[PDB]
Amino acid sequence: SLEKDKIKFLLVEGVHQKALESLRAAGYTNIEFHKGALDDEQLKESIRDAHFIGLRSRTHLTEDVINAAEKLVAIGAFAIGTNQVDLDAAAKRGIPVFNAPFSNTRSVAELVIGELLLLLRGVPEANAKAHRGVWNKLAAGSFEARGKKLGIIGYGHIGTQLGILAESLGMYVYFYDIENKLPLGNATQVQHLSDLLNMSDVVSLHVPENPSTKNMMGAKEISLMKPGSLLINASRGTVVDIPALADALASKHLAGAAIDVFPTEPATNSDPFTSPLAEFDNVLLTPHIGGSTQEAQENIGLEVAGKLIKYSDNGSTLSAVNFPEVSLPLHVGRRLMHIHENRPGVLTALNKIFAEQGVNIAAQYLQTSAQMGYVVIDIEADEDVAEKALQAMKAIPGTIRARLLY
Amino acid sequence: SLEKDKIKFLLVEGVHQKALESLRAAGYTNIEFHKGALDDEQLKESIRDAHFIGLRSRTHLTEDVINAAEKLVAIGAFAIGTNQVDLDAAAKRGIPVFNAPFSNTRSVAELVIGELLLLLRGVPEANAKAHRGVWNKLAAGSFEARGKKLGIIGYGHIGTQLGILAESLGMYVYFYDIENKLPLGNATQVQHLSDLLNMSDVVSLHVPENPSTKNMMGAKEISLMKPGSLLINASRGTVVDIPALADALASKHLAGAAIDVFPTEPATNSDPFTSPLAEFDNVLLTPHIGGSTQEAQENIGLEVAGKLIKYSDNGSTLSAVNFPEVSLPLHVGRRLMHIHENRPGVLTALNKIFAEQGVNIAAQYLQTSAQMGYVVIDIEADEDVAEKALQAMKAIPGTIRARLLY
Amino acid sequence: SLEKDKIKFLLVEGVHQKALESLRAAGYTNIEFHKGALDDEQLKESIRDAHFIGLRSRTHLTEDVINAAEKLVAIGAFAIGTNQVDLDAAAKRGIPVFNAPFSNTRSVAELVIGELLLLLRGVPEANAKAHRGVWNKLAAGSFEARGKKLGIIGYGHIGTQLGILAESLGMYVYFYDIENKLPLGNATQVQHLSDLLNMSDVVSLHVPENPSTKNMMGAKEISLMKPGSLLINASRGTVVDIPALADALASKHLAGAAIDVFPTEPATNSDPFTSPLAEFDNVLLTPHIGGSTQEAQENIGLEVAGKLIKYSDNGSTLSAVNFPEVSLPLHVGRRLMHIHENRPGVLTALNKIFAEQGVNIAAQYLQTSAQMGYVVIDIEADEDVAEKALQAMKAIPGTIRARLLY
Amino acid sequence: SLEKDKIKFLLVEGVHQKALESLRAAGYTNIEFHKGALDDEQLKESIRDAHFIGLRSRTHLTEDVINAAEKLVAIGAFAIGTNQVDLDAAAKRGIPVFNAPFSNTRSVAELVIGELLLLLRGVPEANAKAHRGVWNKLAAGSFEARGKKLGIIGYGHIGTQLGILAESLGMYVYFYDIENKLPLGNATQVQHLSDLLNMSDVVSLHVPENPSTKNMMGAKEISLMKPGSLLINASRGTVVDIPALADALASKHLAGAAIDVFPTEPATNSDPFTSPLAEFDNVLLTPHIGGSTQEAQENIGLEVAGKLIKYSDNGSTLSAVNFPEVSLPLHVGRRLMHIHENRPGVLTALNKIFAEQGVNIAAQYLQTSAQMGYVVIDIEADEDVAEKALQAMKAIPGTIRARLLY
Ligand SMILES: NC(=O)C1=CN([C@@H]2O[C@H](COP(=O)(O)OP(=O)(O)OC[C@H]3O[C@@H](n4cnc5c(N)ncnc54)[C@H](O)[C@@H]3O)[C@@H](O)[C@H]2O)C=CC1
Ligand SMILES: NC(=O)C1=CN([C@@H]2O[C@H](COP(=O)(O)OP(=O)(O)OC[C@H]3O[C@@H](n4cnc5c(N)ncnc54)[C@H](O)[C@@H]3O)[C@@H](O)[C@H]2O)C=CC1
Ligand SMILES: NC(=O)C1=CN([C@@H]2O[C@H](COP(=O)(O)OP(=O)(O)OC[C@H]3O[C@@H](n4cnc5c(N)ncnc54)[C@H](O)[C@@H]3O)[C@@H](O)[C@H]2O)C=CC1
Ligand SMILES: NC(=O)C1=CN([C@@H]2O[C@H](COP(=O)(O)OP(=O)(O)OC[C@H]3O[C@@H](n4cnc5c(N)ncnc54)[C@H](O)[C@@H]3O)[C@@H](O)[C@H]2O)C=CC1
């Protein structure tokens, strides 16, 4: 309450109000909120005395910005992505970076369901025509989704949810994953990708962005899809050979597609968009909105705020993307924490401080990345003894930062 | 087998092959099939010795055509509609007309589900832009369907199926119907339309075409919808005031819409299409395809063929749209039938024929519209006695037609 | 209202109150109700001026009783069975007999579910012991129902409901039926009975009582069941060779059983019960209560009352067990009905009455069993003309009875 | 492989074979298996060189037995209970004790479902009579489960599963829990117990054994149940006032009950059983078999074996019932562990060993109960250096035990 009032939370780019509700319910009310992106100079001014900052995709938390933030304890990327933030620079200063990598699984699943529905029915095509005054009711090849085969690639958080929704619509779900998984409902793992592609009326992609998925769907892979099928991609902009796809649409080997993500995307609603696909009416083209809904924002705000709250209240760095992960249950005494370089001697030095005072260490957890180490410490002591100890902890060769959580 | 070979079935406009499978399985193989619309003179030539004709929307079974068909027993409209066929002229000659009014409930339901999904997510709009090179990711007002309220108007065959699919997607279903109905799953009847319209995020229409539904959704009704909601219409082209709708889209009172049907529709894929709505990207415009899928055609072919088969095998006119409805279970003896004008005296005359011969009438069913009457008759007799009886039946004052089913 | 007050309904053996609610809602309030079985002399006195009687299993509607009932139009067996009623004697006097053959499908299904649950767990056995002071927790061979195979014999009204409940419990359902059927959920028809019996952990019987099911489960059939399995019978008391069953329990080829029905059952709660099975604690023995619940009584009361109401209001004999079945939709004019012996000449005579008066017969339906015939007749006329006509109808050689429904 | 062959696993009282499959799949094959309970002297002989022992309810792991086990690393109670094992004595020697507290949730849920089914239908009662030659079909008060209200007390692992099964049967589920919980399906938390008891047709108990649940259902609580309802208890033998219950059965305030657990239970199938309830046929009495099925044994064997495997492979004491809980993810280097008395100085001493050698501690986790502490340690070193270090670790004042996992 009286200590907490003094911990400043800088929220920019308009994170969801639910984030500020969590913050207040946890006793943190010292919040500077902005709907808009702070510019370089107004950012440097606002972050200067900020304990935490939550941000989105437009803010550039850069080495200099981070290096100028003089009280900064942690960073919250209220989004999935994290590239606007310099993870190493935050690391070096003992600043863990949190985010929300699966707060939007429902949004993406629905989008796919809706897309394959209309695609199977030649609707994006007829609808482009109708707005042009041409009326082309072409029913010969339209189908109902029920009874048909969905091929999911990437049976992860989104894939599994997709498969469930697809079963409610009466489709048969099949998936390919580089690792083996336990199916839900009547899903079915398929061993080689060749079989999936062959038998699927609809193939949808839910994989991550790395070298194994780069151009994963290319001319060869596409021509294994069954004639007249559909390809949907709302995963990552690098997973599909757009020009191969364009060919297979022009040759009518595929009856249509939907793409929500591209190799390069406009930075802003006011930049021009370019794609070979723009020429096909039977293709649905969406500006990276797969995970973009009000519900997704509510989730993101709740999660990431919670993480910041937890790290502040008890030091947990579980799921931090730039730090070593550590969490310790609450039990009586005082908790302290200490970040430092990963060198022989530190842990002892740290512990020594307590032994030589005859203080009982109740629990301790320490984890360590290539160059850094972080460690939480519970101890049975007076506030007096803790403070003094903090000081001594700060002194230890290799110490980056330390703190007395309570 | 030997009698049946001689009963000709004229199929035009390419009805589904399943129709010809039913026909053959029932022992009828004398089929003249055409994928295309026969023209007036080639129609008059093909129908001339045809016992049955199945057709679709393009054929004009007109008084003259019907009057020239010299052996025509019944007509099968392999479609929902029936306006290409002159019902009275068929009636007058004792020709019942069958059709398929609910073979496509799934198709329409899916279309709606797919449409409200993408509509809720501003997808038709972003996708029109993307094809124009403009990239407008506008997520502030996009929602997931789950948790939201669907208002169904017309809880009939399609409505009930819609409500079920919508519940699987996790929506709350509410419906308004001029008559009271038993809800499925967790549906909920709403008493006045005002409440439905007020609370619904999505309103979809599944009513018939008559004077009570004509312009049913007009400026007043639309402005009772909740701000930012969606209106979908895949029922009949007369149910929505297109210009009121256009206003409510231009004023952003509604966030979007989908319309599959219009007051006047192009006769052909090669005619121009016109609507005030063509100017809104956030509106989905589809060329009457609600019920247009391969599955729907399979159903239609199965149903209507079955009806023709039944009427031919046992005289049932259940669901005939231009005749009085009659059906009688099979039990031993000979079945005969007789169509005639609805006048005093006929039934007696008909029965007299059997009494005076000392023949036992086992069963009989007679139904009667304003001017016509139809009656099936089972009797315990020899083929010899039946034939003679048929003759006498033909003689009866007011007789239109008669037949000895077996 | 004024005519209806005069139609007496005699209800004995305490049918459910819902029966009297239907009766009153339909405008019939002249009801003599008895919770108890009327005895021969008090029955003859109460039925004497009764238009309808509803009864249960204890009343003996016999030839004499029926022959003494001087105003009796129809009989309602508020039960499944009908053997206390002399069907032919009722027939001869043109009295249709209704009943309720599937008002209790849920009750029987639940009973089976509950029984196989406890049987699989050796519970009836441990529980007989516990009440005797012996404590025998014998878990080696107890199983959960989930994952196990239920074999249903008789995939009829009860079978299908059973299969559904069993799937909710996570069992695999298989069925054998002498006729081919469309499975629900994931049920599975099995061709020969041998396969069903072999693979089933639990076999339950839901077949009718006739010569094909008599002793259907006998020593040979039982020894095809898988070792340690269970047999449940709540169908008919003649379907299982009780002594074969007794052997297979004594040899531990079967781990247990439940039987709700027997070749001969005590007439009364005060008669002694005898069975070879009484000696096995691992057998559940229930006194024909499969369909005995308050809900079942509510259904029975609603159905059978409805039927009586329908027959009285519009003459329908649909599902009558002793009459020829006939039903006709309502359309303007006056309805009359006529029961008579199945002889040449009657129908004409009947129709003649209307022709010679120049009255238009709007509809007519006539059905005919081996010796009897029943026929409903709509006609366009004045009340005056109808009455006179009724009289003439009564006159017709072979006439048993006639009536002017409205 | 070569090290693992030398780690002896002593399994007694016939744990499930799946336990030995897990053991072998993990590379541990040195197993001494016994279907039977070893007696004191044959136990002391077999455990003498045993690294682990798995046991059930009959074995008395006592201070002396434990103190004589000279190589004993951990104990596996392949059961829920743990009272045959002296937890403190195991603790003092740094022996964690594992068990399986929720491997049988399905078994107990099914038992309840089956019991309330037959109870609602007066079946245990009619069935006791039938075996005595008396036939009492008493249907007036029998009900179907569907539509009825189940009151669950203890919405824990078993409660939640129960509620799900009950919903599939079409019941309405309500629960009371001393803590607040998130409902599944359409369950419903009820605030005071008074409301639950009042509205429930069936009340079933799934709470733990402690002072708050002792005699929780007593005369007052029972008389709040609705007249004619049922009480089921398969939780703990101390939760229900058996004599109050007996009164409420004798007064017909309750229509029946099922009890699987008692204040004192026979030690053996050959001991006599005593209860006031034995006198009521409408009560189901089962010898503590709620969780007793073959599936439950498979679960128990899998879990507990897994835990032993984990503790042996990586030191995890997660869910140990007598130890402080600690778990650490795998990452390169050597893992060691150390149990010791909870005194100032130890951790430093331990760490010192590595610093002064210039060895980098990669991770460390330490947890601490009232008198004991346990700590796992990863370190970057040679096997040589690890061994030497182990030795030094063993030397530390207060050290109880230490080990070099790999
Ligand atoms: N369109 C949009 O706005 C959004 C896109 N996404 C993206 O969707 C993707 C999936 O999302 P999540 O389910 O959260 O991912 P996840 O991590 O839960 O699942 C990824 C799955 O892919 C599998 N996998 C990895 N490489 C593979 C390969 N080469 N071939 C086959 N399977 C492979 C993994 O085993 C895992 O099951 C992510 O890339 C995420 O960034 C997420 C949210 C929104
Ligand atoms: N877009 C397309 O290609 C297709 C459109 N349709 C049309 O959809 C409509 C509904 O189809 P079905 O479910 O088969 O109809 P249905 O006859 O089964 O149900 C119509 C329902 O509307 C109710 N109703 C009638 N007038 C009403 C009013 N004034 N206000 C509220 N409720 C009213 C009726 O009580 C009934 O439940 C029909 O007009 C059908 O022609 C059908 C197939 C395809
Ligand atoms: N225990 C009790 O209190 C009650 C017993 N029942 C009895 O249960 C039986 C079934 O009830 P419902 O489902 O209403 O009957 P149902 O008539 O709906 O189904 C009977 C089924 O058995 C099949 N079948 C007939 N003979 C067969 C044979 N030889 N082998 C295999 N299948 C055969 C038929 O195809 C049909 O599907 C009836 O006998 C009924 O009287 C009904 C209510 C209560
Ligand atoms: N009959 C048998 O063979 C078996 C009996 N059991 C027993 O069943 C009981 C429940 O099992 P689980 O679901 O695993 O327990 P659980 O620990 O998962 O749930 C116990 C629940 O009771 C609630 N609770 C505790 N005290 C309460 C009180 N005073 N009033 C209302 N709620 C209270 C807790 O909040 C918790 O939700 C345990 O005692 C277990 O030992 C378990 C297996 C077999």
A few lines on this structure:
Chain A is built from 13 helices and 15 strands. Chain A is of the alpha/beta class and 406 residues long.
Q: What do these coordinates show?
A:
Four copies of one chain form a homotetramer. The first copy, chain A, has three domains: 1-104 and 294-322, 3-Layer(aba) Sandwich (Rossmann fold); 105-293, 3-Layer(aba) Sandwich (Rossmann fold), CATH 3.40.50.720; 324-405, Alpha-Beta Plaits, CATH 3.30.70. In chain A, 32% of the residues lie in helices and 18% in strands. Chain A starts with 8 loop residues before the first strand and ends with a strand. In chain A, helix 5 (105-120) packs across helix 7 (157-168). Chain A has 406 residues and is an alpha/beta fold. In chain A, the strands form three sheets. A six-stranded parallel sheet of chain A has the order 7-6-8-9-10-11, with helices on both faces. The first copy, chain A, is built from 13 helices and 15 strands. Chains in contact: A-B, A-D, B-C, C-D. One 1,4-dihydronicotinamide adenine dinucleotide binds at residues 80, 102, 104, 108, 153-159, 176-179, 206-209, 212-213, 234-236, 260-261, 288, 290-291 of chain C. One 1,4-dihydronicotinamide adenine dinucleotide (NAI) binds at residues 80, 102, 104, 108, 153-159, 176-179, 206-209, 212-213, 234-236, 260-261, 288, 290-291 of chain D.
List the keywords.
homotetramer; alpha/beta; Rossmann fold; Alpha-Beta Plaits; 6-stranded parallel beta sheet; 5-stranded parallel beta sheet; 15 strands; 32% helix; elongated; binds 1,4-dihydronicotinamide adenine dinucleotide; serine biosynthesis (chains A, B, C, D)
